[PDB]
Design a protein around this nucleic acid. Structure first.
Ligand SMILES: [Mg+2]
Ligand SMILES: [Mg+2]
Ligand SMILES: [Mg+2]
Ligand SMILES: [Mg+2]
Ligand SMILES: [Mg+2]
Ligand SMILES: [Mg+2]
Ligand SMILES: [Mg+2]
Ligand SMILES: [Mg+2]
Ligand SMILES: [Mg+2]
Ligand SMILES: [Mg+2]
Ligand SMILES: [Mg+2]
Ligand SMILES: [Mg+2]
Ligand SMILES: [Mg+2]
Ligand SMILES: [Mg+2]
Ligand SMILES: [Mg+2]
Ligand SMILES: [Mg+2]
Ligand SMILES: [Mg+2]
Ligand SMILES: [Mg+2]
Ligand SMILES: [Mg+2]
Ligand SMILES: [Mg+2]
Ligand SMILES: [Mg+2]
Ligand SMILES: [Mg+2]
Ligand SMILES: [Mg+2]
Ligand SMILES: [Mg+2]
Ligand SMILES: [Mg+2]
Ligand SMILES: [Mg+2]
Ligand SMILES: [Mg+2]
Ligand SMILES: [Mg+2]
Ligand SMILES: [Mg+2]
Ligand SMILES: [Mg+2]
Ligand SMILES: [Mg+2]
Ligand SMILES: [Mg+2]
Ligand SMILES: [Mg+2]
Ligand SMILES: [Mg+2]
Ligand SMILES: [Mg+2]
Ligand SMILES: [Mg+2]
Ligand SMILES: [Mg+2]
Ligand SMILES: [Mg+2]
Ligand SMILES: [Mg+2]
Ligand SMILES: [Mg+2]
Ligand SMILES: [Mg+2]
Ligand SMILES: [Mg+2]
Ligand SMILES: [Mg+2]
Ligand SMILES: [Mg+2]
Ligand SMILES: [Mg+2]
Ligand SMILES: [Mg+2]
Ligand SMILES: [Mg+2]
Ligand SMILES: [Mg+2]
Ligand SMILES: [Mg+2]
Ligand SMILES: [Mg+2]
Ligand SMILES: [Mg+2]
Ligand SMILES: [Mg+2]
Ligand SMILES: [Mg+2]
Ligand SMILES: [Mg+2]
Ligand SMILES: [Mg+2]
Ligand SMILES: [Mg+2]
Ligand SMILES: [Mg+2]
Ligand SMILES: [Mg+2]
Ligand SMILES: [Mg+2]
Ligand SMILES: [Mg+2]
Ligand SMILES: [Mg+2]
Ligand SMILES: [Mg+2]
Ligand SMILES: [Mg+2]
Ligand SMILES: [Mg+2]
Ligand SMILES: [Mg+2]
Ligand SMILES: [Mg+2]
Ligand SMILES: [Mg+2]
Ligand SMILES: [Mg+2]
Ligand SMILES: [Mg+2]
Ligand SMILES: [Mg+2]
Ligand SMILES: [Mg+2]
Ligand SMILES: [Mg+2]
Ligand SMILES: [Mg+2]
Ligand SMILES: [Mg+2]
Ligand SMILES: [Mg+2]
Ligand SMILES: [Mg+2]
Ligand SMILES: [Mg+2]
Ligand SMILES: [Mg+2]
Ligand SMILES: [Mg+2]
Ligand SMILES: [Mg+2]
Ligand SMILES: [Mg+2]
Ligand SMILES: [Mg+2]
Ligand SMILES: [Mg+2]
Ligand SMILES: [Mg+2]
Ligand SMILES: [Mg+2]
Ligand SMILES: [Mg+2]
Ligand SMILES: [Mg+2]
Ligand SMILES: [Mg+2]
Ligand SMILES: [Mg+2]
Ligand SMILES: [Mg+2]
Ligand SMILES: [Mg+2]
Ligand SMILES: [Mg+2]
Ligand SMILES: [Mg+2]
Ligand SMILES: [Mg+2]
Ligand SMILES: [Mg+2]
Ligand SMILES: [Mg+2]
Ligand SMILES: [Mg+2]
Ligand SMILES: [Mg+2]
Ligand SMILES: [Mg+2]
Ligand SMILES: [Mg+2]
Ligand SMILES: [Mg+2]
Ligand SMILES: [Mg+2]
Ligand SMILES: [Mg+2]
Ligand SMILES: [Mg+2]
Ligand SMILES: [Mg+2]
Ligand SMILES: [Mg+2]
Ligand SMILES: [Mg+2]
Ligand SMILES: [Mg+2]
Ligand SMILES: [Mg+2]
Ligand SMILES: [Mg+2]
Ligand SMILES: [Mg+2]
Ligand SMILES: [Mg+2]
Ligand SMILES: [Mg+2]
Ligand SMILES: [Mg+2]
Ligand SMILES: [Mg+2]
Ligand SMILES: [Mg+2]
Ligand SMILES: [Mg+2]
Ligand SMILES: [Mg+2]
Ligand SMILES: [Mg+2]
Ligand SMILES: [Mg+2]
Ligand SMILES: [Mg+2]
Ligand SMILES: [Mg+2]
Ligand SMILES: [Mg+2]
Ligand SMILES: [Mg+2]
Ligand SMILES: [Mg+2]
Ligand SMILES: [Mg+2]
Ligand SMILES: [Mg+2]
Ligand SMILES: [Mg+2]
Ligand SMILES: [Mg+2]
Ligand SMILES: [Mg+2]
Ligand SMILES: [Mg+2]
Ligand SMILES: [Mg+2]
Ligand SMILES: [Mg+2]
Ligand SMILES: [Mg+2]
Ligand SMILES: [Mg+2]
Ligand SMILES: [Mg+2]
Ligand SMILES: [Mg+2]
Ligand SMILES: [Mg+2]
Ligand SMILES: [Mg+2]
Ligand SMILES: [Mg+2]
Ligand SMILES: [Mg+2]
Ligand SMILES: [Mg+2]
Ligand SMILES: [Mg+2]
Ligand SMILES: [Mg+2]
Ligand SMILES: [Mg+2]
Ligand SMILES: [Mg+2]
Ligand SMILES: [Mg+2]
Ligand SMILES: [Mg+2]
Ligand SMILES: [Mg+2]
Lengths: 96, 62
RNA sequence: AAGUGUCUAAGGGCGCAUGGUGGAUGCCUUGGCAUCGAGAGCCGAUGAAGGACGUGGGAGGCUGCGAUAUGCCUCGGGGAGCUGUCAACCGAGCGUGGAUCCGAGGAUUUCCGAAUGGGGAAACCCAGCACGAGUGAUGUCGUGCUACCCGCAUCUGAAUAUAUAGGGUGCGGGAGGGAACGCGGGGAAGUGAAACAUCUCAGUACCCGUAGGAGGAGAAAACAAUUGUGAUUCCGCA
RNA sequence: UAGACGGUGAGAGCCCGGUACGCGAAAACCCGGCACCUGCCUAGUAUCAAUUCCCGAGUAGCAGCGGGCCCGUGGAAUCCGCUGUGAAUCCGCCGGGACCACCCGGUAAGCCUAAAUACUCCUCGAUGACCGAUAGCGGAUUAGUACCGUGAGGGAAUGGUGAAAAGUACCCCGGGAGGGGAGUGAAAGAGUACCUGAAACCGUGUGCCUACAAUCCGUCAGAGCCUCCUGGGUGGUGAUGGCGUGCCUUUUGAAGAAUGAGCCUGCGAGUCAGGGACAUGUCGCAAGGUUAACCCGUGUGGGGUAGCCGCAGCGAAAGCGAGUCUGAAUAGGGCGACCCACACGCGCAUACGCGCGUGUGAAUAGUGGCGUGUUCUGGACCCGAA
RNA sequence: GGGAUGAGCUGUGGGUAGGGGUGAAAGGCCAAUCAAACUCCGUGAUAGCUGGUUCUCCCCGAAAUGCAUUUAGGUGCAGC
RNA sequence: AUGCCGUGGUGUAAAGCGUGGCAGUGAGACGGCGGGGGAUAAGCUCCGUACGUCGAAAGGGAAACAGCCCAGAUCGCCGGC
RNA sequence: CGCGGCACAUCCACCUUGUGGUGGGUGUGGGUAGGGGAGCGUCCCUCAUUCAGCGAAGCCACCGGGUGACCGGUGGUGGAGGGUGGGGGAGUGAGAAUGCAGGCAUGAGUAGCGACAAGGCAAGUGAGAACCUUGCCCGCCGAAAGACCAAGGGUUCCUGGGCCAGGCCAGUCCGCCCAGGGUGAGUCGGGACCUAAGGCGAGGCCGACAGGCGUAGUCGAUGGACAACGGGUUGAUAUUC
RNA sequence: UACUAAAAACACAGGUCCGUGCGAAGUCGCAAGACGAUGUAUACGGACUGACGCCUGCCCGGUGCUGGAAGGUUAAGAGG
RNA sequence: AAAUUCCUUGUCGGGUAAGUUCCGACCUGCACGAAUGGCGUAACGACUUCUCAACUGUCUCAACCAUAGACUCGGCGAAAUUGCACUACGAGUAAAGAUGCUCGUUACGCGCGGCAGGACGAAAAGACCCCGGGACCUUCACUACAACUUGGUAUUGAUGUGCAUCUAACCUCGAACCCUGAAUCGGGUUUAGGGACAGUGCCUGGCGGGUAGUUUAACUGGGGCGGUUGCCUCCUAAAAUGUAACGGAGGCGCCCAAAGGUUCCCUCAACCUGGACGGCAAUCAGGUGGCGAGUGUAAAUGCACAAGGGAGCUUGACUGCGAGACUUACAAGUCAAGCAGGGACGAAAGUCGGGAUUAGUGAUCCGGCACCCCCGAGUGGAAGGGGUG
């Protein structure tokens, strides 16, 4: 910028560190589980990888966006609180 | 070859969920005694990069 | 008398016509460039790579060859022309009793060159020994061998005794070259940092050593993280 | 099974060399087999028990100074070099990023090891939306030659008659050179100065103008001549009148007496690579999209899910999640979600609608390809130092 | 015009080599080049500087300002 | 006085604004008006000016004459104002 | 302003009312840097089609055409490749870089034709003579402008030819071109003898490597040693025959 | 000062100072080695001055050089 | 009065008709001076300088002659340069010096020999100057390195009391002998010495223009020198904002624990009149006096309703925030109601997130400290990192 201290040097670094050991979760929402599994039934990590709501070979957690009207038995990793709330409210089960 | 992203820019800017580029603000690192809390709180947090810095900042991050 | 009134080209301009110069354009090509698929990946003291000087019926160059000199022998192929090419002219010949030509193997292979008998301004000079040839005899000619270092094996064992250094002999080997690719080692600067020293350039260029057909690496003092993988290399990701 | 390619007097499958295809090797070399040969085994095995010994040294470790790894010495781990110090042999030692404990992994200080990888001086066989004589190699030509330099080094230029030399006998001018006539040839409007034969440049002939006029050289107006066709129109010229300060670069501003250009011909400057980056145009598929290496195919085709991008964000992070961070806060703020047009279907509003689901966008929403502009790293539009 | 038996001139053969040589010293000379030779290579060095950058038409059309700048003939952002 | 800010009407196509792609420019000149510096010199210099022209604007006028006055060249006409 | 042509933007009405066309309005069309849009020409490839020895390309002239880059027709020349269209790809366009190569102008029939020794006549040869040959006059050098050697050059030497290049003019001449010929050593100058400076250097010492230095030794004349004189002869050799 | 400077510049004989006790000091080389020198303080090297005559005064504060080591400061090493 | 003297042609004397030069002095030495030698000096000098004689074409002042060119003829036959071209002059105009533009004037076309005023003639991308880059040079610029030097440690040992001695490491370019035939090399053997020193390796301090790479600002009416560089206030500034100059003026790089917050109270300066020390001006009293005083500190805008003066109690000189604004290229800078926590003052209303306001300041990086316990390289820790201040 002609010699004044540039924008990438005037400003401070963003604070903090990145966690080397962070566990990243693929995300599925009970809304899209309802969308992909209208009749309910057993829901597995492999099953919703196959139906395409989640990437393969990753830990997947279920979140609570959208409605659940399906009697669903979802076996995922580390559900959300609202996710279990509406999964059981629809009569299904949420299992690690 | 493959483009190298600018290191200092990558540590001074980040993108939000909708693509806005944010940044923290200068003058909060030291000489804080004479700075009143109104000024330090104005300087606290993150702001969106100025509209006419956006193009160069995006070029640096990309 | 007054007046108006053409015409002329020393040369020059413009346009045509017709030529010259020149070598563009177009179209080519016994030449290149970049690849792909196969090979071959070394040559050298049994003298290399590369040369010098010679060699042909005619002068030179190229090319081939080496005093056996565009050539010698053998084994194959082939079948009528041939005596290479700039490059025509001739001259003189050869060939179905198989030439020219093509393939393979061998023979010859001056001198220089690692060059190595010694010397030297590379392609030159001067030898020693042995065996032959030649002379009346010295002269002279031909062929081998004769560098240094290393290793091995034998003999000897200085000062000095044990001994060793060294020396003698006999076998082997090395040396030098090669476009790229490998490995190990040494290792810039310009440049970039809008200056510049950290940093970069870049372990690049270059250099040294040293290969091989490839090389290096390679068989866990490995990774990994609670079930695990199981030499190395290389490619793609990450 | 031959229409590859080239030659032959002009585009040849049937004319020639060949081509498809089929044969072919004395010998040499290469490859493989059988022998011959060489080497190993014909004596160990199992169990018990863990009393004894064995595992590669000036090495490891440690300290110093360096090097190298993303690590530029940092808390510096692993690895390498030198200096000093200097172990232990499994109830050892090393690594797991200071270190300690535990746990896990492995056995340094000896060597060898194919294949997948790199390269092409060289040999065959092909190929080219490569060049075509100022190009392409410097080199189609005496080419690393000539030439230049003491030397290391530098380093050119020069291709084309014609199908066939049929390369012009003979005669004439001329000392020859050169030419004329003859002759050859389809052509000499191909004559070894040779295919085509542009421009600059140089003549010759010819129409008009031009020796009283001050001219960026033209332009508009315009007589008259000349020419060729039917007074008229072309084409040439241009007496005479007006207007009129070259081109380029670079400048506030140049006709400028600022720069560059004698002329002509040829050559001489935003290119290419990358699943790069951004944005766009377009096309495919679409909550998905797409492969990379690689594999298989005479190809451009078919496989190939590793990966990448999209799919949820917030937070330094643990983490939580349509939320999340700050905060004591059911305070406020930050960032993020409320995703589109048309239609139907539902849990139903009289038929018109909130939400949620099919669908249809084959721009949806992304993703991949291709085009373009810009950009990154490369010489990066080209030329130029000291 | 100076020296011209001398610190003379000159031949032949040799030695010293580039941050080096040599210099009765002028930064002189080291192959017509010397305040660091020449050649090749790094290399197409770099140059905020100078120059050049080639066909056409259609539409629109600036700026020579502010801020900052080891900046002032450059550049970033703004303005247009 | 102008100028400026807001607002309500009226008028006015190529206003404005946001956000992207691609810029160039960042040496200005003179003239009018208001000022500084200078010697109320300079074809001087430095500012201001919803001022102009040149720059990048040909045509007409000013003898000639970027920057003054008139006027903004789409092309053609041997028409007119 | 009038009349006619074009273009851009935008608006209104018909036609598959946006891919958009048609008609009509309205406004607009100076322009450097610069942005955007649309095209011309060259070459190559693919597909289709069509020309071409009854003549392609290229070039030249003339006549025409388009809003521009440019295009077409006809004829001449020429001798083997073109045209058009759908696409694809560029070493795709030059007037400038004191750009590069080649050709050719301008200066200009100009300067100059290289020492201030000096030429002349007669005859000859010849196509051609200031320059060549012969003779004779004249002049110049003569411590060289003569005769030799070394270094260097390399055949320039001699003979016979030649005469378009070269020679600063011309040339019959020539150190030019062509062919043939020519250089004879016991004693000359060198080696086979010797060593100087210096060079190389077995082993060796030193140095990470590369390599440096150096002993023995071996080279290295410009020096030391070493035996020939006089005459004659060829076109060209001679202390050589 | 080859090629615009020949001088008053350089050199010089003479002078002084400093270094050097000997494979010296100095110099060339990483070293070996070499020159110095087949020299040995009447010698060699460096510095300044510049025949000869008369002379060469003051300052040791600064900076060098030479010598000294009482004390202060301090690196590695040891220590811990 | 100089190879030194600026003033300066100093002054005096000499030399000349006339002397800024010359010679001799004077001393007022801008700025002489003793080995960067001082002052002299015979001889010497293609040195510099002044004078005289002689001599002369140097000159007054030129003339003539010969030769080589020039010129003519014949032959051969370049060159630099070149945007063009049937290239006048004057006065103008214009990038401010015109063949080319204006208005005039002058001029038949073309050669030849001459001259050199112009074509800002030709030649070398100005050497001067400035800007950018470079090179080399210097040094008490920076940072390195070589060399030199210091200590530790290894090589490196023994004995006694760091010191001494010893010898065996190591060293010797002391000597002899052998390889060796030829050897001033080398090596070995012996001897004579030195000697755990030296040298060398690693580590380490010093020194180090000897060498190397580099830096050494910009603005600027050219550059240098001088001055300046950020912030605040005013004027310039053309009555919003903004606005340049090396334009005109000043301040700032703090201070205050109260000079902050709050509650309450007060009004100043000056003048006049009277009054022990006391006066023009100390304190007092009374009038008059609305701001002429004061404001921590420049200036401006403000403040008498006070923001000026005084007193009481206090720490809001807060924590978590912050709608919305101003300003602005960006980075920054500025204001902020109001909400909550926990407080201060106040009876309450309320006010308080420093100071009447606007200067008293410094991005990022890299680190430090306190806290929080966020991550913690197999795991538990820890190291280290992170957040907040
Ligand atoms: Mg902080
Ligand atoms: Mg604070
Ligand atoms: Mg051609
Ligand atoms: Mg081999
Ligand atoms: Mg031949
Ligand atoms: Mg031959
Ligand atoms: Mg033989
Ligand atoms: Mg046979
Ligand atoms: Mg044969
Ligand atoms: Mg053979
Ligand atoms: Mg030999
Ligand atoms: Mg030899
Ligand atoms: Mg013995
Ligand atoms: Mg080898
Ligand atoms: Mg560097
Ligand atoms: Mg730099
Ligand atoms: Mg730069
Ligand atoms: Mg191997
Ligand atoms: Mg064919
Ligand atoms: Mg270590
Ligand atoms: Mg390291
Ligand atoms: Mg082991
Ligand atoms: Mg092992
Ligand atoms: Mg191996
Ligand atoms: Mg392998
Ligand atoms: Mg191959
Ligand atoms: Mg081939
Ligand atoms: Mg070529
Ligand atoms: Mg030569
Ligand atoms: Mg004829
Ligand atoms: Mg005829
Ligand atoms: Mg005929
Ligand atoms: Mg023909
Ligand atoms: Mg020709
Ligand atoms: Mg021809
Ligand atoms: Mg007339
Ligand atoms: Mg006139
Ligand atoms: Mg006219
Ligand atoms: Mg301009
Ligand atoms: Mg100017
Ligand atoms: Mg000009
Ligand atoms: Mg001119
Ligand atoms: Mg200029
Ligand atoms: Mg020019
Ligand atoms: Mg995040
Ligand atoms: Mg929120
Ligand atoms: Mg799409
Ligand atoms: Mg492309
Ligand atoms: Mg360049
Ligand atoms: Mg003389
Ligand atoms: Mg004399
Ligand atoms: Mg004399
Ligand atoms: Mg000098
Ligand atoms: Mg020279
Ligand atoms: Mg240099
Ligand atoms: Mg490079
Ligand atoms: Mg416009
Ligand atoms: Mg700065
Ligand atoms: Mg910009
Ligand atoms: Mg600027
Ligand atoms: Mg400016
Ligand atoms: Mg201005
Ligand atoms: Mg004014
Ligand atoms: Mg002005
Ligand atoms: Mg103005
Ligand atoms: Mg105008
Ligand atoms: Mg006008
Ligand atoms: Mg006019
Ligand atoms: Mg009228
Ligand atoms: Mg336009
Ligand atoms: Mg207009
Ligand atoms: Mg433009
Ligand atoms: Mg025909
Ligand atoms: Mg014809
Ligand atoms: Mg063609
Ligand atoms: Mg035509
Ligand atoms: Mg035609
Ligand atoms: Mg034709
Ligand atoms: Mg064509
Ligand atoms: Mg086509
Ligand atoms: Mg195309
Ligand atoms: Mg091109
Ligand atoms: Mg051209
Ligand atoms: Mg040109
Ligand atoms: Mg030329
Ligand atoms: Mg002339
Ligand atoms: Mg003449
Ligand atoms: Mg002559
Ligand atoms: Mg005669
Ligand atoms: Mg005489
Ligand atoms: Mg005499
Ligand atoms: Mg002769
Ligand atoms: Mg003859
Ligand atoms: Mg002749
Ligand atoms: Mg002649
Ligand atoms: Mg040796
Ligand atoms: Mg030697
Ligand atoms: Mg010798
Ligand atoms: Mg000899
Ligand atoms: Mg001799
Ligand atoms: Mg003779
Ligand atoms: Mg000179
Ligand atoms: Mg001279
Ligand atoms: Mg002396
Ligand atoms: Mg002494
Ligand atoms: Mg010494
Ligand atoms: Mg001294
Ligand atoms: Mg002196
Ligand atoms: Mg003294
Ligand atoms: Mg003292
Ligand atoms: Mg004097
Ligand atoms: Mg005087
Ligand atoms: Mg005097
Ligand atoms: Mg002195
Ligand atoms: Mg003196
Ligand atoms: Mg003299
Ligand atoms: Mg005369
Ligand atoms: Mg003449
Ligand atoms: Mg005239
Ligand atoms: Mg004039
Ligand atoms: Mg005039
Ligand atoms: Mg004119
Ligand atoms: Mg004349
Ligand atoms: Mg002149
Ligand atoms: Mg000039
Ligand atoms: Mg210049
Ligand atoms: Mg010093
Ligand atoms: Mg020491
Ligand atoms: Mg030591
Ligand atoms: Mg230096
Ligand atoms: Mg540098
Ligand atoms: Mg400056
Ligand atoms: Mg100034
Ligand atoms: Mg104002
Ligand atoms: Mg105003
Ligand atoms: Mg101040
Ligand atoms: Mg208070
Ligand atoms: Mg108060
Ligand atoms: Mg505070
Ligand atoms: Mg806020
Ligand atoms: Mg409260
Ligand atoms: Mg209370
Ligand atoms: Mg408040
Ligand atoms: Mg204050
Ligand atoms: Mg930094
Ligand atoms: Mg852990
Ligand atoms: Mg660990
Ligand atoms: Mg901690
Ligand atoms: Mg906070």
């Amino acid at each position: 910028e002609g010699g004044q201290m540039p924008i990438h040097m005037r400003l401070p670094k963003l604070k903090g560190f990145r966690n080397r050991f962070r566990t990243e979760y693929e995300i599925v929402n009970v809304g899209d589980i309802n969308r992909l599994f209208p009749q309910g039934g057993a829901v597995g990590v492999d099953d919703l990888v196959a139906k395409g709501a989640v990437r393969k070979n990753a830990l997947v957690k279920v979140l609570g966006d959208g409605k659940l009207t399906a009697k669903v038995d979802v076996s995922a990793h580390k559900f959300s609180g609202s996710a279990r709330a509406k999964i059981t409210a629809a009569g299904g089960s949420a299992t690690e | 070859p493959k483009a190298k992203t600018h290191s200092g820019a990558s540590k001074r800017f980040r993108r939000t969920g909708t693509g806005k580029i944010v940044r923290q603000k200068a003058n909060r690192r030291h000489l804080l005694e004479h700075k009143p809390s109104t000024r330090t709180r104005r300087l606290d947090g993150r702001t969106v990069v100025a509209a006419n810095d956006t193009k160069r900042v995006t070029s640096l991050l990309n």
